[PDB]
Design a protein around this ligand. Structure first.
Ligand SMILES: [Cl-]
Ligand SMILES: [Cl-]
Lengths: 119, 116, 116, 119
């Protein structure tokens, strides 16, 4: 398969390892800490208020609802593939398998019809 | 305690739920997907090549090293408060309810970010 | 759907929430711990050395291979219903709400267990 | 460090890779499927009805409450280590760290004061 996905604890979400290089983006930023160094090599950037991460954050941080300037929806998406059975299905990207624990998708994410802030 | 942290599978990295509102940054973007929908409301922005996220990406996508324009290091980091393997960059943290909670508000620590 | 499945970190293995009540088995026991308490109410029982759990254990505990008395294989397995990389041993499964749910009741499939 | 721990999806629980060899044990058994083969190389065995796994199972399987013969508590445990600060703490076993994503404990589990069905 191609694209790999990293589950995030405490939310029904995954980091898709399909990079879009050298883009600029605006929103509410959550630091990602490297635990062994304390370096911050990456940030989670929320661009609207609907999603599992938004829900979790509202619960973790009750002022954020009132402080944020984000839209409720900003429009970004991937178009979920059509159904084919006997498969392992993840709605936004389709067929999956487990490889020594890691989530691997059959398709490359970059190749589904998606829209992001830089489009 | 005052700050919650979500571990990311496959890396020694946590999402600090300590918002910095309406900032702009540049880097390599990874969609965060929800299992239930194609709607995307968040991305991971990598800002250097030495972070654990960068490192996991290279293993997964061998060609990304050639295309990225990120520096090896950006001076973004968090400093803990006033043997070393077992310490944390933010101070005391505890596993609870599927996540981690720490004893301090992240915002109270010394932290440098791209908007500094 | 009728059966829920919990992935186990680091292995291509799932816990089928399809109980078989009051059975007795023999094998190598691993405590399952809750983050909030020292109370233990469940264990993983390995029953062979070729399962993914066995394999992860060897990497973590090099001396356990010499001490275990388990066979290489026990004929416990599940058969799916009436290209091959993308299939599942139980049929259709979907990611939902942090776990997996399948379209069948596990108990309805052909399965051999130590109590067979 | 020594003992390694495997988070289980959907519950605040972990498999402790500290084996107790060739023991016999009774209870309600959940198969553990190898996804790439369909082999069942291991079973989860519940020995009482209190715990995060019991809770999740009650929600997944509402007949189980009425069908099970387990006690509410069977007594098994590990004695949580005493507190020392700046550490990463997991109540039942103490100091932890992350190693390329994996949970590693400072102690060997087998060396805390614990009790199990075979004791
Ligand atoms: Cl990889
Ligand atoms: Cl290991």
């Amino acid at each position: 398969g191609l694209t790999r996905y990293l589950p995030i604890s405490g939310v029904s979400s995954v980091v898709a390892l399909s990079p879009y290089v050298n883009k600029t983006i605006t929103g509410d930023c959550l630091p990602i800490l490297d635990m062994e160094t304390g370096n911050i090599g990456a940030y989670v950037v929320l661009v609207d208020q609907t999603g599992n991460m938004a829900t979790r954050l509202r619960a973790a941080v009750p002022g954020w609802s009132r402080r944020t300037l984000l839209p409720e929806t900003a429009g970004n998406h991937v178009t979920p593939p059509e159904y084919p059975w006997n498969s392992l299905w993840m709605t936004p990207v389709g067929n999956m398998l487990f490889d020594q624990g890691t989530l691997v998708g059959a398709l490359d994410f970059r190749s589904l019809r998606s829209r992001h802030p830089w489009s």
